Design a protein around this ligand. Structure first.
Ligand SMILES: Cc1cc2nc3c(=O)[nH]c(=O)nc-3n(C[C@H](O)[C@H](O)[C@H](O)COP(=O)(O)O)c2cc1C
Ligand SMILES: Cc1cc2nc3c(=O)[nH]c(=O)nc-3n(C[C@H](O)[C@H](O)[C@H](O)COP(=O)(O)O)c2cc1C
Lengths: 362, 362
């Protein structure tokens, strides 16, 4: 029935944050989210960025695994071109086992050429999408634990035969229940190749909210690819990422956003980038304004899901009418490490008072 | 000063233990060792083994990081041929940062062909594992330095990018704590150890598995000669030596707890048949004047293992020190006491607080 609440931890940590502080904020976020019934926590991967400063989401997932009871974790995404697929497959399976299946897997190519370069991919010639395909092909076969060898374009890998007593046969690091984890992919462009791939393979679709047109287009491409490949598209699997903040009143919610960590990140970091690459055009069209006038207050008033629980509940209901809805509201985590209380109260309000009222039509 | 106490967590988990139980035991082990002043915890890496069932020691280190105050962690060892070196270098630096330098790095080739095969290396003991170790380390040290390069190697492509042409837009810094390579360790097992020679040449930390008096002395001979020849001053206090060690109130109950507990079980079921098949108890047999064919559990408990009361163990260590010159860290092998850890925890407290402080290094 009800739309779930999720957390996406990019993260967006203020420049100057230490690794220990970031890791601490991640574990506290996992524990708090689990405590208020948030369904899932996605954790991103970057080796070359300042704000998005987690190069190994699996370390955080592992650190929070036995400190949580119900929440599911997902790297979003492991960048398949950057790792040996056998090493990655084994880790994925083992971590899935540790979590007793409270796990799913995000895969991706990587959008940052500086980081592609570090991992030996120049002019991001090798093809990152082909690397993704070959890695996944390999990992799926390692999880099956049937012998094979593969001399690939990008990697060599295999699964060995047993040597000629339980203690002497091969380890079993297949994911929980002995099968592949549920796999997810994120889409950003309007006509998303990733959405197409996901429908084709029956993967979990993940969108970053960039306007009504793009959201509709993502589900259009995904469902048609799915039905064509013989799958039944399920809206409840669709996760959509939003900037969301809740407080007792609209006035306090807007103020806390405008004056705190969220407004600070947008003003200092995200807006200049989004403006330079015209990424607020979908927002501008939706609201009828000119992209040149897309500022923090415009976003807070027309884009972000900000207000009292009632105001936020209404805004989500509106989007649902316009789009058809989605399965998980994936709340973007911001740097409240120094001021946890209003952020935790906000998440608690979303998970317990907002999301349960939002019902899926499909 | 005093000889330090260390823990080595291979692990040796009874066949049938789940990934969750293994992970839980590792974290509980790290916390308890920290609480009784154990200096370091080494965690091994295997993808194909049953008893030694941790394919990603860094996950356990990360999970124990914020739960401990003083203990230092090391993967022992990361198998360099199995990972992209840029991905591995980045993880090592970030984890070193999270731990605020309570970290050091074991590297190795890998001694299990079934696991080598998984990672694309056929006919392991064609690609050369030691050459793979060299190229990986060459790359990782340059990534930690954060100076631009690109390397087109025999086994990997990797590099470090130039900054693009505001702090928030500069490259991330995932260099290890203090901006320098971590201290690097290698383990030796064979009599005339190439690993001991390499460690000497490069001023790495030597780690030996105790296999008899002659090998222990040969290890230090090979290491020191390589060290002096390369122009370093060999330091015995950096030498770590792994022993099977159990302490109790009296010699009688210490022996009984070993014979009748997890340690005796692992040795009887798993280790002894292997060691006997590959003549690995010949050094022990030579030492005690018996024939290898007569090496069984009780022989090991009586003449090899460091077992008894605090005084008996202290005297046994002194005899070894007089015979070999000694070592800096007594690396205690962790066994599967997850079901009933009280006598194991007490033993570790006795070793760390009552035994080791009395052993000084000449
Ligand atoms: C604001 C923003 C956030 C993003 N977050 C993620 C993320 O969390 N995980 C991820 O794998 N990719 C992320 N991306 C990159 C896109 O998901 C990537 O381009 C996509 O996988 C490929 O898009 P397409 O196939 O729709 O062209 C993000 C991009 C933007 C602009
Ligand atoms: C009982 C036993 C325990 C071992 N434990 C470890 C270990 O904890 N870490 C490791 O890197 N290698 C371990 N090894 C493998 C040896 O370290 C390996 O032979 C060595 O790295 C290469 O030795 P050499 O260069 O002297 O031939 C172990 C081997 C045996 C037989």
């Amino acid at each position: 029935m009800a739309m779930e609440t999720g957390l996406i931890f990019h993260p967006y940590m203020r420049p100057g944050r230490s690794a220990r502080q970031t890791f601490d904020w991640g574990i506290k976020s996992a524990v708090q989210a689990d405590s208020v019934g948030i369904d899932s926590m996605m954790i991103s991967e970057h080796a070359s960025q300042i704000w998005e400063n987690i190069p190994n989401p699996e370390l955080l997932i592992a650190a929070a695994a036995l400190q949580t009871k119900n929440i599911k974790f997902a790297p979003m995404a492991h960048l398949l071109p950057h790792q040996h697929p056998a090493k990655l497959a084994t880790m994925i399976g083992w971590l899935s086992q540790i979590l007793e299946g409270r796990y799913f897997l995000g895969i991706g190519a990587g959008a940052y050429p500086q980081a592609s370069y570090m991992h030996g991919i120049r002019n991001a010639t090798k093809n990152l999408n082909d690397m993704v395909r070959e890695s996944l092909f390999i990992m799926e076969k390692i999880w099956k634990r049937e012998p094979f060898f593969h001399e690939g374009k990008y990697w060599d890998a295999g699964y060995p035969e047993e040597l000629e007593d339980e203690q002497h046969k091969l380890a079993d690091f297949s994911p929980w229940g002995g099968k592949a984890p549920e796999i997810a992919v994120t889409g950003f462009s309007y006509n998303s190749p990733s959405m197409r791939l996901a429908g084709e393979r029956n993967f979990k679709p993940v969108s970053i909210f960039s306007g009504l047109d793009a959201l509709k287009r993502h589900w259009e491409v995904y469902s048609e690819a799915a039905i064509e490949a013989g799958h039944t598209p399920d809206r409840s699997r669709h996760a959509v990422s939003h900037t969301v903040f809740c407080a007792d009143t609209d006035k306090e919610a807007k103020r806390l956003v405008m004056e705190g960590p969220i407004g600070y990140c947008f003003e200092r970091y995200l807006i200049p980038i989004w403006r330079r690459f015209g990424m607020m055009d979908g927002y501008a069209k939706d609201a009828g304004i000119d992209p040149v006038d897309a500022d923090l207050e415009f976003l807070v008033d027309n884009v972000f899901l900000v207000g009292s629980p009632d105001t936020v509940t209404e805004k989500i209901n509106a989007l649902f009418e316009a789009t058809g809805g989605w399965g998980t509201l994936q709340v973007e985590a911001h740097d409240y490490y120094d001021d946890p209380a209003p952020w935790f109260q906000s998440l608690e309000l979303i998970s317990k008072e907002v999301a349960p009222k939002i019902l899926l039509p499909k």
